[PDB]
Design a protein around this nucleic acid. Structure first.
Ligand SMILES: [K+]
Ligand SMILES: [K+]
Ligand SMILES: [Mg+2]
Ligand SMILES: [Mg+2]
Ligand SMILES: [Mg+2]
Ligand SMILES: [Mg+2]
Ligand SMILES: [Mg+2]
Ligand SMILES: [Mg+2]
Ligand SMILES: [Mg+2]
Ligand SMILES: [Mg+2]
Ligand SMILES: [Mg+2]
Ligand SMILES: [Mg+2]
Ligand SMILES: [Mg+2]
Ligand SMILES: [Mg+2]
Ligand SMILES: [Mg+2]
Ligand SMILES: [Mg+2]
Ligand SMILES: [Mg+2]
Ligand SMILES: [Mg+2]
Ligand SMILES: [Mg+2]
Ligand SMILES: [Mg+2]
Ligand SMILES: [Mg+2]
Ligand SMILES: [Mg+2]
Ligand SMILES: [Mg+2]
Ligand SMILES: [Mg+2]
Ligand SMILES: [Mg+2]
Ligand SMILES: [Mg+2]
Ligand SMILES: [Mg+2]
Lengths: 71, 88, 129, 85, 122, 222, 33, 104, 211
RNA sequence: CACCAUGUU
RNA sequence: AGUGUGGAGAUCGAAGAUGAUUAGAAACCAUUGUAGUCCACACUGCAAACGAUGACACCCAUGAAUUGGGGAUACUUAGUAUCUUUACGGGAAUAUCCUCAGCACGCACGCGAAAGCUUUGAGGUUACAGUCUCAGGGGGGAGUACG
């Protein structure tokens, strides 16, 4: 249920502002926590230097050695 | 003249559904519970003539057990049933 | 508590039409309720109705002809200009060929078609069809 | 067939059973009686649902006893419902 | 156990319905009758049918049997059924008066025809 | 080859009843699919299989698999029918679902969005059909809009003769068993809404089984 | 059985573990401040 | 999960009362609310038919005219105890709503 | 339904018709009453049983007779009974009126299973008690068949269009109710004149034990 | 109403 | 439940003890027993603190009951008793009918994913608007960390 009053716009504005934070997608865009933890820093690509070649095993039920590098 | 028309006066309705005489409700093609009761008309002498009175009762009314009361109301208005007895 | 007499009245009539009653009693009544009823009466959606005086907010007995599919009030009143008539018809009316939106205007309480003819806006009161 | 009940004009059967505030137009259930003194023959008007005990203005003793509903008139006194209007 | 299957019971009921007059309370004569009025490979089934056929005949003597329809016996019951008494039952009560309750008395008084002539309050 | 077993079917074979509207007018149940075949002109009736999916019943020795088949029928002129049947074989279920669709044929009322020029092109008023959690809402649209609907409702609306309509669906619309029936239920509601042009009362006709009762007595006797 | 599948230990005993863990962390910060 | 009983297995409607004081089960002593416990009032004979006839022979007071005393006791059980002692058994879903108002 | 367009008093209940009604307790209720059956009750006795208004009992009876008479093809009316007391009564009603009839257990699917080979399609259904003939009424609700019922004071009126308020528990009362219905249909058809009393005994309508 | 723990992906 | 200070301390009884059972059993069972359980005063503010269902108001079909207080004994008015009865006594309880308020039962629309709800709504909602307010936005991490 919700308020319906003609002069209750302030309550409806406050309600939407508080509840928009519950949306994980909306919160991620309006918070800097994701960008600070993002290695690219919000960029589409990033240049780097190969440190070593490593083999990563596929998750169950797959069985493989996915070839990766440390950058 | 009941139904949908254009400016050319072409009745574009596929058909005109029956209207219930008690509830003024359109009777759908898949009611399967709406009934049609014909009551014969009596002449001066206590013998039926060749004419009958037809009533339409919607199916939903019968499921509620209200068709009997509705038919009583309809027959009284139509002049078929006596509502109350006369003076002794 | 009861905050809208018009909303209570229209809900009572709409519920009675759903159950296929021939008559319905409205309590309480007001000038707005009578004006709304007369608009439906003019278009043939309700029959005769009688206002009963009890030296208080009166009561109304309404005769129903079975042609009213649904009537209801719009809360809040939601001011409607002459250019918003089609928007309200698109949102709350089943079709453009029938059904009315009742508004309260400086010229009085009237349906949307009559108000559009007189080039007046106002506040939306309710609807019926 | 039976007579359907008109909401605007209810039959006396249904309206009589209704609560006073549930009638088509609400109204009182109470009335006033002319009570003569059991030993004075002086007439005093007494409310049917009186809750304050009523004296005979010359007799100066109780005429009715308060109850949860209608008042209980004293023994051996005449009374008659005064017309409502 | 010795339970007659639906194959035996259905055949026995058919035999009685069509050859009731030629059947008896004795298994051995009924077996001879059944032998030439039925077609079957199994001698055991015919013997079982003869056993249940004799059982039905004993039941039929004591009274009607459900599932068996003898057309001749249906007439005779429907004959004595439609033997109306010299007077209708409504006549005896009407000529002796009808006793009705006080509530019924008030109903009749308000009718157009009034109180029936031969009706008296209890 | 067809020997009618119902009074309605006997009249149809004898051509005493010639149109589906007479059956629809008196709300007569249809128990033989050959009635629809006769009353609908050759080539006018089109059918199409909408969905076939398997259903499984667990058993002690594994599980039992049957196939549920959905069939749509119509003439694109205000008649639509939906049938769903389950069979051990896909072909058997497909054939049974076609018969079921003809038995559930309903009339569809068509109207105009704005001006009444030409033949009706849309539904006359807003209707919602519900089946399970799936609800399909049809809204009248102007000419040239087309059927703005999901591919499953769009095919059903095409078979019913609706040209322009706005559609909105809610609930688990991927449940196509319910999505198909929800659209069908909305179309069935078109001839149920009391519109002001239907306010005038009509003279009650006679049941065709009543009107030809004496002829039907002859066929039953013989 | 009265509840649905927990996917873990009994939640009441999980709560007791957290309470005991919270208490231990509270005392550890007491001896460093 | 799903609500098994509209009653919730007791005799306490939503707005009748808050707390009913528990009672000890007749067999195991489990504390169960008095409105929820399965309650049986049993009248038990002190001796069986064979034993009653033997004691009556040696009794100048008890005989054909004077009945021997009985045992009167109201027994309230825990749910588990009532199921185990077979005073109450699980019923089909349809028959669960059958209620008895007198000893039968 | 005595109200005729002319206004003659021919169909009104007479003393002879009324006298037979009270004779075998056709007006006595079941001590239990239903809301839909309330309008047909005149009052309650000291014993506790309800009394059926004979004016409205007669008015419904004429309405039922007129409906059956309007059926141009008899055997389009099926009269059903399940309580074993209408078995003789419905059988005798079929003879003088020419309607179909059935007694005992109603076979489910009789009106709906089109390949049953016992499939029948009556246009009007008559039952002796809605409570015991519920299967016939329920089936009729799927194939557009109006129902005429003999209803006592506690009767479910679901899918019942013409209700005749009468005692449907007594052997005599059931026979009387069908006897009047059989007589009225013939009078309405003109088969038997309204002046000469009918010569067919109501005792033949009565259910006597088949011994 | 003694004691009946477990089963590689 | 727990905490503080005074009381009280029969019963039962976290901790603990002993005896069994067991592969193990400091678990279930047996015998005990501390804190508690009880009271006064002062803290704590958590419960499946549940109808897992916020508050106020409107409409809403049927049958049998129950608690408290009253009234009666498209119609112009429609019945009836029983028991006790020298002082909390012009009494008390009953029977029939009506009524207002309260906890509810079997059960018509309608609603719902269903289980089920139904004048006691979870009904009167895509034909979406009586008023206010609280909370929720895949599962975990976590009602954790920090303040
Ligand atoms: K295991
Ligand atoms: K706490
Ligand atoms: Mg809310
Ligand atoms: Mg379990
Ligand atoms: Mg469970
Ligand atoms: Mg859960
Ligand atoms: Mg865990
Ligand atoms: Mg309370
Ligand atoms: Mg509690
Ligand atoms: Mg219990
Ligand atoms: Mg292990
Ligand atoms: Mg202390
Ligand atoms: Mg072990
Ligand atoms: Mg260890
Ligand atoms: Mg040990
Ligand atoms: Mg040990
Ligand atoms: Mg120990
Ligand atoms: Mg130790
Ligand atoms: Mg909490
Ligand atoms: Mg709870
Ligand atoms: Mg509550
Ligand atoms: Mg909570
Ligand atoms: Mg709460
Ligand atoms: Mg109380
Ligand atoms: Mg009371
Ligand atoms: Mg909304
Ligand atoms: Mg989440």
């Amino acid at each position: 249920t919700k308020t319906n009053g003609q002069n209750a716009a302030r309550k409806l504005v406050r309600l939407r502002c508080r509840n928009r934070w519950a949306d994980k997608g909306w919160k991620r865009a309006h918070t800097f926590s994701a960008r600070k933890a993002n290695p690219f820093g919000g960029s589409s690509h990033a240049k780097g230097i190969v440190l070593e070649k490593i083999g990563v095993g596929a998750k169950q039920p797959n069985s493989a050695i996915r070839k990766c590098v440390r950058v | 003249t009941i139904g949908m028309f254009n400016e050319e006066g072409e009745n574009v309705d596929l058909y005109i559904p029956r209207k219930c005489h008690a509830t003024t409700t359109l009777i759908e093609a898949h009611d399967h519970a709406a009934v049609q009761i014909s009551i014969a008309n009596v002449g001066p002498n206590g013998v039926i003539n060749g004419t009958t009175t037809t009533l339409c009762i919607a199916g939903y009314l019968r499921s509620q057990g209200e068709s009997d009361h509705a038919i009583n109301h309809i027959t009284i208005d139509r002049g078929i049933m006596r509502i109350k007895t006369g003076k002794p | 508590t009861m905050m809208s007499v018009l909303a209570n009245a229209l809900r009572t009539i709409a519920s009675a039409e759903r159950r296929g009653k021939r008559q319905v009693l409205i309590r309480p009544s007001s000038k707005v309720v009578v004006k709304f009823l007369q608009v439906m009466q003019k278009h043939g959606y309700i029959g005769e109705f009688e206002i009963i005086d009890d030296h208080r907010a009166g009561k109304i007995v309404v005769n129903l002809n079975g042609r009213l599919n649904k009537c209801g009030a719009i809360c809040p009143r939601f001011d409607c200009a002459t250019t918003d008539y089609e928007k309200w018809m698109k949102n709350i009316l089943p079709s453009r060929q029938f059904g009315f939106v009742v508004l309260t205007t400086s010229l009085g309480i009237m349906d949307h078609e009559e108000a559009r003819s007189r080039n007046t806006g106002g506040k939306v009161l309710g609807f019926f069809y | 067939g039976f007579f359907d009940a008109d909401l605007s004009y209810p039959t006396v059967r249904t309206e009589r059973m209704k609560h006073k505030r549930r009638r088509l137009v609400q109204g009182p259930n109470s009335y006033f009686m002319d009570v003569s003194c059991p030993r004075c023959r002086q007439v005093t008007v007494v409310y049917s649902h009186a809750t304050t005990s009523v004296e005979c203005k010359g007799c100066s003793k109780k005429l009715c006893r308060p109850t949860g509903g209608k008042a209980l008139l004293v023994e051996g006194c005449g009374y008659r419902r005064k017309p409502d209007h | 156990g010795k339970i007659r299957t639906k194959t035996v019971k259905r055949a026995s009921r058919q035999v009685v319905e069509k050859y009731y007059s030629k059947l008896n309370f004795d298994f051995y004569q009924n077996k001879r009758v059944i032998m030439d009025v039925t077609i079957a490979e199994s001698k055991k089934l015919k013997n079982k049918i003869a056993g249940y056929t004799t059982h039905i005949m004993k039941r039929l003597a004591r009274g009607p049997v459900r599932g068996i329809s003898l057309k001749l016996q249906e007439e005779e019951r429907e004959r004595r059924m439609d033997h109306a008494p010299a007077t209708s039952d409504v006549d005896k009560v009407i000529q002796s008066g009808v006793s009705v309750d006080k509530k019924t008395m008030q109903m009749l008084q308000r009718l157009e025809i009034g109180v029936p002539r031969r009706v008296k309050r209890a | 080859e067809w020997v009618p077993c119902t009074k309605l079917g006997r009249l149809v074979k004898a051509q005493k009843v010639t149109s589906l509207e007479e059956i629809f007018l008196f709300s007569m149940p249809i128990k033989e699919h050959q009635i629809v075949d006769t009353l609908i002109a050759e080539g006018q009736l089109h059918d199409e299989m909408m969905k076939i999916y398997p259903v499984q019943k667990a058993t002690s020795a594994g599980q039992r698999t049957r196939f549920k088949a959905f069939n749509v029928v119509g003439d694109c002129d205000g008649h639509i029918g939906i049938g769903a049947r389950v069979g051990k074989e896909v072909s058997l279920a497909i054939r049974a679902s076609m018969i079921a669709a003809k038995l559930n044929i309903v009339p569809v009322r068509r109207g105009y969005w704005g001006n009444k020029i030409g033949e009706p092109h849309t539904i006359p008023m807003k209707v919602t059909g519900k089946c399970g959690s799936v609800a399909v809402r049809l809204v009248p649209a102007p000419r040239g809009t087309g059927i703005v609907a999901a591919p499953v409702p769009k095919k059903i609306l095409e078979f019913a003769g609706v040209e322009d309509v706005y559609t909105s669906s809610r609930g688990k619309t991927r449940t196509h068993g319910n999505l198909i029936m929800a659209t069908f239920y909305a179309l069935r509601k078109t001839y149920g809404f009391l519109t002001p042009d239907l306010w005038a009362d009509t003279e009650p006709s006679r049941d065709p089984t009543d009107e030809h009762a004496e002829l039907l007595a002859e066929m039953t006797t013989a | 059985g009265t509840v649905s599948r927990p996917r873990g230990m009994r939640p009441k005993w999980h709560k007791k573990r957290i309470k005991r863990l919270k208490l231990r962390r509270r005392r550890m910060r007491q001896r460093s401040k | 999960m799903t609500t098994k009983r509209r009653n919730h297995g007791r005799s306490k409607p939503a707005h009748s009362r808050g707390r009913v004081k528990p009672i000890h089960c007749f067999n195991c002593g489990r504390l169960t609310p008095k409105d929820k416990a399965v309650g049986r009032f049993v009248v038990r004979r002190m001796l069986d038919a064979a034993s009653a006839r033997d004691v009556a022979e040696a009794s100048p007071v008890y005989g054909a005219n004077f009945p021997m005393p009985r045992l009167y006791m109201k027994q309230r059980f825990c749910i588990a105890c009532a199921i185990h002692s077979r005073t109450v058994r699980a019923r089909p879903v349809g028959n669960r709503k059958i209620r008895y108002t007198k000893k039968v | 339904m005595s109200a005729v367009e002319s206004g003659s008093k021919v169909l009104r209940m007479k003393e002879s018709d009324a006298q037979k009604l009270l004779a075998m307790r056709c007006h006595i209720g079941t001590r239990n009453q239903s809301s839909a059956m309330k309008k047909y009750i005149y009052g309650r006795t000291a014993e506790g049983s309800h009394i059926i208004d004979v004016h409205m009992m007669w008015e419904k009876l004429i309405l039922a007779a007129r409906v059956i008479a309007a059926v141009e093809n008899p055997k389009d009316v099926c009269v059903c009974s399940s309580r074993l007391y209408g078995t003789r009564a419905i059988y005798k009603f079929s003879q003088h009126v020419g309607t179909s009839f059935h007694g005992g257990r109603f076979i489910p699917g009789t009106f709906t299973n089109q390949i049953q080979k016992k499939f029948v399609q009556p246009r009007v259904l008559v039952v002796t008690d809605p409570r015991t003939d519920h299967q016939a009424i329920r089936e009729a609700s799927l194939v557009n068949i109006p129902v005429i019922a003999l209803c006592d004071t506690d009767a479910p009126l679901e899918y019942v269009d013409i209700a005749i308020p009468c005692n449907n528990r007594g052997i005599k009362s059931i026979g009387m109710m069908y006897w009047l219905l059989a007589r009225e249909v013939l009078r309405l058809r003109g088969t038997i004149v309204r002046s000469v009393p009918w010569e067919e005994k109501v005792d033949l309508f009565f259910y006597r034990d088949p011994n």
